[PDB]
């Protein structure tokens, strides 16, 4: 029974680590790719925009996407809400990557303590992604986003634009982060048994 217990704990810890790496990949992808919100059929102009980077069409029945924005240059970010959301998603990235690093502590540190430490960072990572995803719609009333989507668009209102794959992927990241945290906490309190 005890050997089955140890095998199950070891295997599920490996699976946790794999899913944590997957969530880190997800966090990097949603932070980088500018596909949070995008145009629709009724939109005045085409394009997309993420946390800081935004591409918009010129409007001549072609693609001609001019792109602007960069986290390294906060002046180009359309809104302070966008800046805050980008900062929070970065913080989540820093925390999840810091966990992956702490995995290294399993050699020496107490397994239970490591699980728990990695777990708390994974919880905060979830908290900061939550704050970022809640604050990001606040900046939709910016002049650039209004010129893109339409006059209907505003604070916490899509208007005519539609959410693209990165935004729902970030919501999935929030869920995966809170969930992963728990599996860790229990993984820890269990290891002690």
């Amino acid at each position: 029974y005890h050997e089955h217990y140890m095998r199950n704990s070891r295997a599920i810890g490996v699976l946790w680590a794999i899913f944590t790496i997957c969530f880190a990949i997800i966090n990097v992808v949603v932070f980088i790719q500018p596909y949070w919100v995008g145009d629709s059929v009724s939109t005045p102009k085409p394009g997309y925009f993420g946390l800081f980077h935004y591409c918009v069409g010129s409007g001549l029945a072609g693609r001609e996407l001019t792109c602007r924005g960069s986290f390294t240059d906060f002046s180009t970010i359309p809104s302070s809400a966008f800046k805050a959301a980008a900062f929070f998603v970065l913080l989540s990235m820093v925390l999840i990557l810091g966990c992956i690093t702490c995995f290294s502590l399993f050699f020496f540190c107490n397994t239970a303590t490591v699980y728990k430490i990695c777990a708390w960072m994974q919880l905060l990572a979830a908290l900061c992604l939550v704050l970022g995803c809640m604050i990001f719609p606040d900046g939709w009333d910016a002049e650039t986003i209004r010129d893109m989507c339409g006059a209907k668009t505003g604070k916490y209102s899509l208007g005519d634009c539609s959410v693209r794959w990165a935004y729902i992927l970030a919501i999935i990241g929030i869920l995966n982060a809170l969930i992963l945290s728990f599996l860790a906490f229990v993984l820890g309190n269990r290891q002690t048994d």
């Binding site: 990097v28 980088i32 690093t101 020496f108 239970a112 303590t113 229990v186």
Partner: protein, 51 residues
């Protein structure tokens, strides 16, 4: 603590944890290279492929 342990007993390590500082060099010897390699991986991937 769905298990029923104390909330602190199930959430924090306010039991032993500091004491284990003598092994802090042993921790850092593998922590710092891992962090640098991870930063380089994300940095180069982000600046070459994803953007």
């Amino acid at each position: 603590c769905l298990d029923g342990k104390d909330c602190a007993s199930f959430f924090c390590c306010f039991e032993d944890c500091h004491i284990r500082i003598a092994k802090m060099d042993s921790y850092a010897r593998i922590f710092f290279p891992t962090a640098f390699c991870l930063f380089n991986l994300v940095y180069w991937v982000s600046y070459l492929y994803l953007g």
